[PDB]
Amino acid sequence: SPGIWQLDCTHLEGKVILVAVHVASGYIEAEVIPAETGQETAYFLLKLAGRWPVKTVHTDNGSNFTSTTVKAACEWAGIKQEFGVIESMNKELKKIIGQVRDQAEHLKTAVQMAVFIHNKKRGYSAGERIVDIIATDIQ
Amino acid sequence: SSPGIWQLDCTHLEGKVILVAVHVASGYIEAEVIPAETGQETAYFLLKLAGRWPVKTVHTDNGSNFTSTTVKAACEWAGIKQEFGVIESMNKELKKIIGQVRDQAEHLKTAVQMAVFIHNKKRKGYSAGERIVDIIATDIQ
Ligand SMILES: Cc1nc2cc(-c3ccccc3)nn2c(-c2cc(F)c3c(c2C)CCCO3)c1[C@H](OC(C)(C)C)C(=O)O
Ligand SMILES: Cc1nc2cc(-c3ccccc3)nn2c(-c2cc(F)c3c(c2C)CCCO3)c1[C@H](OC(C)(C)C)C(=O)O
User: Fold this and answer.
1) Fold of A1-139
2) What b/e sequence results for B81-108 when a residue is b if at least 16 CB atoms lie within 10 Å of its CB, and e otherwise?
3) Using a CB-CB distance cutoff of 8 angstroms, which residues of chain A are in contact with residue B47?
4) Separation in Å, CA of B85 to nearest CA in chain A
């Protein structure tokens, strides 16, 4: 479905990366966060929901995802949460980060470079698929 | 007019800087509260924007944070064309929504993200969020 996203956290260089994947397209949004907290997760979801049509979010049962702050943000945004593709995206994003890591001072820059590379990679790219999927659902 | 052209600007609110990006053809907005009006903050914002949407051209004023070599270098890496000098009212509308929802959040960054959500979902046939994907899908063909 065009409104389904998978979310998870991944670790790199003793830092936390919050990753969102649009399941149907492979399009990703990622951010380096100071810690895996409900406040960081809620803020990320609120940004994501204002940018794309977010209908359902699939996560695991980690405390940052089951947090009442997150539940309340989803209730405000009209998002359905479901607990218990993102497994491989973690590896691919980590591969691209490793490839460009020495081109940036900060890990957050390397992460945003990796998101750009991933989403533009073409014969459609993930960035083209997501808008094609969503535009057809609007008819 | 084109699906890859964005207008960027800085606004101030409560002693903080808000960087606002408007997709000119749709009225779609992306905004973030930044700790300081610097080339580094502006470059980082553009890098995130360019990885999320097709960004071909960025129109800004001649502010030092936009004329910065860090921003010029980030645009060069991303293949973005920079151009300097109704979207003047976008800062006013965003500030209007921010003011309406301000007491519903502790942090200004939250109120800004609530305002972006409200603005992009607003129908009064199509919303800005629908128009951006429709304009970009049309040009993909
Ligand atoms: C700290 C820092 N200083 C500087 C300085 C100059 C720079 C480069 C050429 C001429 C003049 C200045 N660029 N530049 C960058 C910079 C900015 C980008 F947008 C970017 C890239 C990088 C390396 C790589 C390609 C993708 O885009 C940074 C990065 O940090 C932030 C993103 C700012 C938080 C960093 O992590 O190194
Ligand atoms: C600090 C803070 N604490 C809390 C606590 C609870 C909360 C709400 C209901 C039950 C249990 C806890 N929510 N909540 C929020 C919160 C989170 C949202 F995603 C959000 C909204 C807000 C108010 C409003 C509607 C839009 O979505 C925040 C906000 O801060 C961050 C975004 C986290 C950085 C804030 O600035 O107030």
Assistant:
1) Nucleotidyltransferase; domain 5 (3.30.420)
2) ebeeeebeebbeebbebbeebbeeeeeb
3) 109, 112-113, 116
4) 27
